[PDB]
């Protein structure tokens, strides 16, 4: 996480539940990354409790969520004068769903009493619409690449830990070394004995 500084327009952390000061010493046994694009005028929509057009329909954040979210400006990558139609979003659905799930089904929406039976007619429209973006928009309509970072604390053996090993060694001096948790003081001296690899 020391490569965190790469971009000048880098946006602030606004981490939820974990302070950025103590991420290095704390260890997470599993890191989950969720990346999808959000328009610039609902960048604050990703928060527990807060609802909207996308919060309860595409990605819901639970109250007991740990991790952080980040965003940056990418208006010169995913924007064209003709218009981008590769990105699609869901708009119509019956109700909200459980957090942490992926929905692929794109069946016809039911709004009226008479069913449409898959025919695009009255009281039934395609719920899947495109992200219409142009390079001449204002400060609130740029495509922002947003990745959601979540962790798990106390659920499995931990391997992901920050670097705490002092980045240097000692020869011919007694120091308070910390060898993977144990603390001791003594001079590191070469030994003529043979040590098995384990």
């Amino acid at each position, epitope marked *: 996480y020391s490569v965190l500084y790469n971009l000048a327009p880098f946006f602030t952390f606004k981490c939820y539940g974990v302070s950025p000061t103590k991420l290095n010493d704390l260890c997470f046994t599993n890191v989950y990354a969720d990346s999808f694009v959000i328009r610039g005028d609902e960048v604050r929509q990703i928060a527990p409790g807060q*609802t909207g057009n996308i919060a309860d*329909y595409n990605y819901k954040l639970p109250d007991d969520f740990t991790g952080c979210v980040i965003a940056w400006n990418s208006n010169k990558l995913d924007s064209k004068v003709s218009g981008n139609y590769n990105y699609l979003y869901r708009l119509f659905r019956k109700s*909200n769903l459980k957090p942490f799930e992926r929905d692929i089904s794109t069946e016809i929406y039911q709004a*009226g*009493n008479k069913p449409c039976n898959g025919v695009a007619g009255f009281n039934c429209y395609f719920p899947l619409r495109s992200y*219409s973006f*142009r390079p001449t*928009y204002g400060v*609130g*309509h740029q495509p922002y690449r947003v990745v959601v970072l979540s962790f798990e604390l106390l659920h499995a053996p931990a391997t992901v830990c920050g670097p705490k090993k002092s980045t240097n060694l000692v020869k011919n001096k007694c120091v308070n070394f910390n060898f993977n948790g144990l603390k001791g003081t003594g001079v590191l001296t070469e030994s003529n004995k043979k040590f098995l690899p384990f």
Partner: antibody, heavy 116, light 109 residues
Framework: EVQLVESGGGLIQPGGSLRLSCAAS????????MHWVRQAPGKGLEWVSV???????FYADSVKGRFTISRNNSKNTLYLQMNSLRAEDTAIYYC??????????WGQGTLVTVSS | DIQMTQSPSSVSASVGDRVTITCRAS??????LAWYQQKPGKAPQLLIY???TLQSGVPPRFSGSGSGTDFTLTITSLQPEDFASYYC??????????FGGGTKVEIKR
């Protein structure tokens, strides 16, 4: 084939309680989005309230959440609760539905007049 | 704090004449745009749904499009039945809260 009707409006004292009714002909209220718009005399239309799928609703910034939305799927209608009426609240009310931040079909309208 | 005002306040034009109304936004909004026709005595009716595509039950001669913060609307072959208040509602992406003062058009005598 589709027509929206409103009822229950009339003269009411400030601070009173009244329930509006809006039934959709050929449409299920539990699925689509409904919108509420007001228009006081002398000025234009103004959005009032919107209903999501369930458990969440957003109101105007000037108001302090004085409308509560209750919907029953059995009767296919919508109910609103009047609370904390003021002199500015006197406006015409239109029953509206929306989709994709757009409005297509509006009702004939009902009148609510607060007489201080 | 949307801060939209429709200019000009009122215009006068007749059948065969040229008339247009411009609605601008203080902040940058996308290609989404809509127009409404508000006449007294009854509920207003919509004009278009998308940026350029029209409604099924509206005349095909209504013209209006835009890309930046400025939008405009005009009529090709004016009719006496299209004299009502004009309103603009482009987008808000969260709650669809945008509108202007309005503009009323009258026919000559």
């Amino acid at each position: 084939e589709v027509q929206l009707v409103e009822s229950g409006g009339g003269l009411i004292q400030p601070g009173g309680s009244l329930r509006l009714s809006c039934a959709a002909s050929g449409l299920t209220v539990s699925s689509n989005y409904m919108h509420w718009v007001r228009q006081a005399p002398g000025k234009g239309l103004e959005w009032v309230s919107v209903l999501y799928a369930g458990g969440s609703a957003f109101y105007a910034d000037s108001v302090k959440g004085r409308f509560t939305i209750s919907r029953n799927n059995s009767k296919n209608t919508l109910y609103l609760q009047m609370n904390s009426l003021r002199a500015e609240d006197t406006a015409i009310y239109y029953c509206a539905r929306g989709l994709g931040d757009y409005l297509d079909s509006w009702g004939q309208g009902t009148l609510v007049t607060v007489s201080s | 704090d949307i801060q939209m005002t429709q200019s000009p306040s009122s215009v006068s034009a007749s059948v065969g004449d040229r008339v247009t109304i411009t609605c601008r936004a203080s902040q940058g909004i996308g290609s989404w745009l809509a127009w409404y026709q508000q006449k007294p005595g009854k509920a207003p009716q919509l004009l278009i749904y998308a940026a350029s595509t029209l409604q099924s039950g509206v005349p095909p001669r209504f013209s209006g499009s835009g890309s930046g913060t400025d939008f405009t609307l005009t009529i090709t072959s004016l009719q006496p039945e299209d004299f009502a208040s004009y309103y603009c509602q482009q987008a808000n992406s969260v709650l669809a809260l945008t509108f202007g003062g309005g503009t009323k058009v009258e026919i000559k005598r």
